[PDB]
Design a protein around this nucleic acid. Structure first.
Ligand SMILES: [Mg+2]
Ligand code: NA
Ligand SMILES: [Zn+2]
Ligand SMILES: [Zn+2]
Ligand SMILES: [Zn+2]
Ligand SMILES: [Zn+2]
Lengths: 162, 162
DNA sequence: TTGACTCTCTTAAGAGAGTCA
DNA sequence: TTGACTCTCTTAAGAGAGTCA
């Protein structure tokens, strides 16, 4: 809600509830042929999810609290960042999964950045493969690699140059 | 159905028309601190665009030809690939700008790949910076770099471990 | 046959808000 | 007050199809 105290109380209640989600260990590529281990705190697959939580889409949730007799609601991954600017360079700030695991709500696996920065981590080589993200990746992005391009650049005639 | 010869004729008329678009020289980052040059064949900002071309969105165009009294229409960047498979790994193939310049229709600046592969090139370090795309990038992606993350992973209590 | 407009849709990273019990 | 559902929207890489003269 409005006060900094009220916001801190929201963050603390969320952390306490998410802290009781099942902890699932995931072994992950780091880049450079190395592997690491992440501990994701995963929201349940079906109701009940935890105090204050409800599912608004297949992999979307919201956190809800009643403050001063008014309901306040947030996207379930945005709560750690309620004291942060909600935009950057005129772009909306988004909760970004460093673990690439939507159900995970571990705040040690989240950052707060533009949707472009968020998306781009899907192709990052990872913290041991050349990640240059200033807020470093926790793993190689799941889509990193050579790709599966069907056809490359080509012309039939002689009208074009690179 | 259009024959192979008729499809080749469509590609040839498309190349003839696009080859007469304004050719703009752009200096671009290649990665590794190196600079290169790309020559983009840019569709005009407003009508007329060229024979067969029309705008269906702010940065979307279509190519149209009428063959044996039947109107055929294609996305304006898809024409170089009409003789190629149109899906791979269960994913639709998309025209992918190696030059990251939407108005460009140079077929030497296009490839044909899944939408995920297409998007991922935005963050590639480039052909002189570590690109691993099997069909190699022509330049460093416009979004490559450290990013502008507003807040990193953090917790207030001690409920979580990474 | 052609040009210049019109409209909505796909994807996968993300959101906000209303209806009931 | 709290829970469990419902719906549509945003972005930036991409699409198909209709109307009129
Ligand atoms: Mg692209
Ligand atoms: Na993400
Ligand atoms: Zn996680
Ligand atoms: Zn990274
Ligand atoms: Zn180009
Ligand atoms: Zn590349």
């Amino acid at each position: 809600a409005l006060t900094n105290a009220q916001i801190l109380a929201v963050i603390d209640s969320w952390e306490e509830t998410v802290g009781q989600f099942p902890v699932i260990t995931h072994h992950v590529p780091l880049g450079g042929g190395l592997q690491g281990t992440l501990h994701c705190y995963e929201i349940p697959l079906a109701a009940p999810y935890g105090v204050g939580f409800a599912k608004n889409g297949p992999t979307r949730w919201q956190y809800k609290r009643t403050i001063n007799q008014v309901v306040h609601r947030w996207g379930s991954h945005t709560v750690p960042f309620l004291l942060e600017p909600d935009n950057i360079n005129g772009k909306t700030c988004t909760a970004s999964h460093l673990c690439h695991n939507t159900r995970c709500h571990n705040p040690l696996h989240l950052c707060w950045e533009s949707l472009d920065d968020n998306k781009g981590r899907n192709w990052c080589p990872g913290p041991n493969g050349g990640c240059v993200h200033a807020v470093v990746c926790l793993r190689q992005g799941p889509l990193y690699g050579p790709g599966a391009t069907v056809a490359g650049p080509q012309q039939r005639g002689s009208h074009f140059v690179v």
